[PDB]
Amino acid sequence: NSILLAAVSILSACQQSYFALQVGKARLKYKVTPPAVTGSPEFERVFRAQQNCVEFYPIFIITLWMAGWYFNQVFATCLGLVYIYGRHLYFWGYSEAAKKRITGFRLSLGILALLTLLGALGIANSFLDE
Amino acid sequence: GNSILLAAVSILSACQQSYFALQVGKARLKYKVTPPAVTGSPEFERVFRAQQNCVEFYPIFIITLWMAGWYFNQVFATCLGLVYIYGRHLYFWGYSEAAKKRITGFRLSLGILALLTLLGALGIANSFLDEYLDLNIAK
Amino acid sequence: NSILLAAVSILSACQQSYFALQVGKARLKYKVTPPAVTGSPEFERVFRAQQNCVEFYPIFIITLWMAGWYFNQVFATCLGLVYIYGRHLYFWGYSEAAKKRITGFRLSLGILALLTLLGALGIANSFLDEYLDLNIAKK
Ligand SMILES: CCCCCCCC/C=C\CCCCCCCC(=O)OC[C@H](O)CO
Ligand SMILES: N[C@@H](CCC(=O)N[C@@H](CS)C(=O)NCC(=O)O)C(=O)O
Ligand SMILES: N[C@@H](CCC(=O)N[C@@H](CS)C(=O)NCC(=O)O)C(=O)O
């Protein structure tokens, strides 16, 4: 069983594709011609927000699966849901103003350290039984 | 094991990505762009942006590829996987010659990514209704 | 029986987060206010190095697991550790001067390449097991 992990993962991949879509409409609304990524200030906020998310994505996925596999799938899955929401706050907050990114950011960084902690314990815990 | 095809596509796609990184490295030398800068030459700037768009989407493609292959069909996911790799080849070399000649390869690889997403969502769903609610769409 | 892969994977994730933190400390120290990523030579080097690392991360993870799953987990694990070390040289090297990034860059692309090779052999050998040929005949 990894079905809960599997659901959360497909969920998050849809959010990441959505964010990429938001940048695509921002190019048109603020007339920023590829390959440029600068000019309009709110475009730079949208672009930078989507970039920070897309960077951290594989890191969320790995910690998510290690925790779910070596600690508990249901608990990890729940944390996973919380992360997806924190990233929803981060993205939309930042789009409006750089200081509105702060809540969603702290939320998503909290979950991530926890996931790391849980995955690290279960992996450790698992090897002392051997 | 019953993932041997997925593993093969993954390794192929990973080689294409390292290949894209090599071109950026060679473009840096051809147009004399001093690191860590990434602007100055229009032809460099198109190559950099192209590799950037590919390298962003890579983990999304991988998750979508494996979820399709595990919960829907390894052979169908595997075949789409190859075409996606092909589309990104068009996108990259397309964008490199002109900003607007990236579009065919762009629509191809994204169309495919969505189909794979669809399949992954169905199979995961089907497996979920059969494992916590005892309902299979089997008929 | 993927316990070693899991461990290396958690180490590398911590490494990546530590790098992200450096960019954050650099933002405060050289006054680069978000969403800007230019404006200070020392920041731009730290930023660019961290960007190269996080982009290459999923490529390393896939390659690590295909090798570890289809060839040998202990050997893939060891290569994984040396790669994490190469990225350590690369990042701090680049932070001091763009031209001190080259050793760690070479070590880690060397490793990635070895991992890509081993995974390809292992998948091949493993594919022949549904053709019933196993090169346990070379063992
Ligand atoms: C000494 C620690 C062992 C490092 C090897 C395993 C790497 C794993 C941890 C962090 C990634 C890189 C950051 C390392 C943080 C400790 C080293 C440091 O802070 O400075 C290094 C020096 O300034 C320039 O070589
Ligand atoms: N700081 C430069 C050089 C970094 C580096 O070590 N390798 C570069 C080119 S020399 C690379 O392979 N980049 C792939 C990419 O980021 O596009 C950059 O990121 O463009
Ligand atoms: N992966 C991040 C790590 C650095 C980081 O955490 N930056 C914080 C600054 S506290 C951020 O969210 N910056 C907003 C932005 O990049 O636009 C990056 O390279 O930007």
For every residue of A23-92, DSSP letters joined together read: HHHHHHHTT--TT---SSHHHHHHHHHHHHHHHHHHHHHHHHHHHHHHT-HHHHHHHHHHHHHHHHHHHH
Give the end-to-end CA distance of chain C in Å, rounded to a whole number. Answer: 22
Q: Is C68 exposed, middle or buried (0-12, 13-18, 19+ CB in 10 A)?
A: buried
User: Given B50, B95, B124, which is nearest A6 (Cβ)?
Assistant: B124
- In angstroms, this model's resolution equals 2.5
**Test mutation, A3, A5, A14, A52, chain B, max B CBs within 10 A:** A3
DSSP assignment of A78-106: HHHHHHHHHHHHHHHHHHH-GGGGHHHHH
Q: SS3 for B110?
A: helix
Q: State how far the Cα of B11 lies from the Cα of C119, in Å rounded to an integer.
A: 8
CB contact under 8 A, C9 and A66: yes
* B50 within 8 A of B38, measured Cβ to Cβ: no
Closest ligand to the CA of C44? 2
CA dihedral A43, A47, A49, A50 (to 10 degrees): 140
Q: Is the peptide bond before A41 cis (omega within 30 degrees of 0)?
A: no
Q: Is C25 exposed, middle or buried (0-12, 13-18, 19+ CB in 10 A)?
A: exposed
Would you state the structure tokens that stand for residue A130, as one six-digit string? 């051997």
Give, in degrees to the nearest 5, the angle at Cα C80 between C75 and C83.
Answer: 130
Would you state the structure tokens that stand for residue B130, as one six-digit string? 């059969």
- What one-letter code names the amino acid at B43? E
Neighbouring chains to B with at least 3 Cβ pairs closer than 8 Å? A, C
Contacts of A40 (CB under 8 A, 6+ apart): A26, A30, A31, A32
Nearest to C68 by CA among C11, C137, C122: C122
Would you state the structure tokens that stand for residue B68, as one six-digit string? 């399709």
CA distances from C19 to A23, C26, C105, C125 (A): 25, 11, 16, 38
- Solving technique for this entry? X-ray
Nearest to B3 by CA among A128, A35, C137, C119: C119
Instruction: Name where chain A breaks: residue before each gap, C-N > 2.5 Å.
Output: none
Q: State how far the Cα of B124 lies from the Cα of B135, in Å rounded to an integer.
A: 13
- What's the alpha-carbon Rg for chain C, to the nearest Å? 18
Would you state the structure tokens that stand for residue B126, as one six-digit string? 């089907």
Contacts of B1 (CB under 8 A, 6+ apart): none
**CA count, 13 A, side-chain hemisphere, B4:** 14
Q: State how far the Cα of C54 lies from the Cα of C56, in Å rounded to an integer.
A: 6
**CA count, 13 A, side-chain hemisphere, B61:** 31
Contacts of A114 (CB under 8 A, 6+ apart): A79
Q: State how far the Cα of B127 lies from the Cα of B116, in Å rounded to an integer.
A: 16
- What's the DSSP call for residue C98? G
Q: Which residues of chain B neighbour A58 with C-beta distances below 8 Å? A: 59
Strand ranges in chain B using DSSP code E only, listed in sequence order: none
* C30 within 8 A of C22, measured Cβ to Cβ: no
User: Given B36, B37, B59, which is nearest C58 (Cβ)?
Assistant: B59
Q: Which residues of chain B neighbour C66 with C-beta distances below 8 Å? A: 7, 10-11
- What's the DSSP call for residue B40? S
Contacts of A82 (CB under 8 A, 6+ apart): A107, A111
Residues in chain A: 130
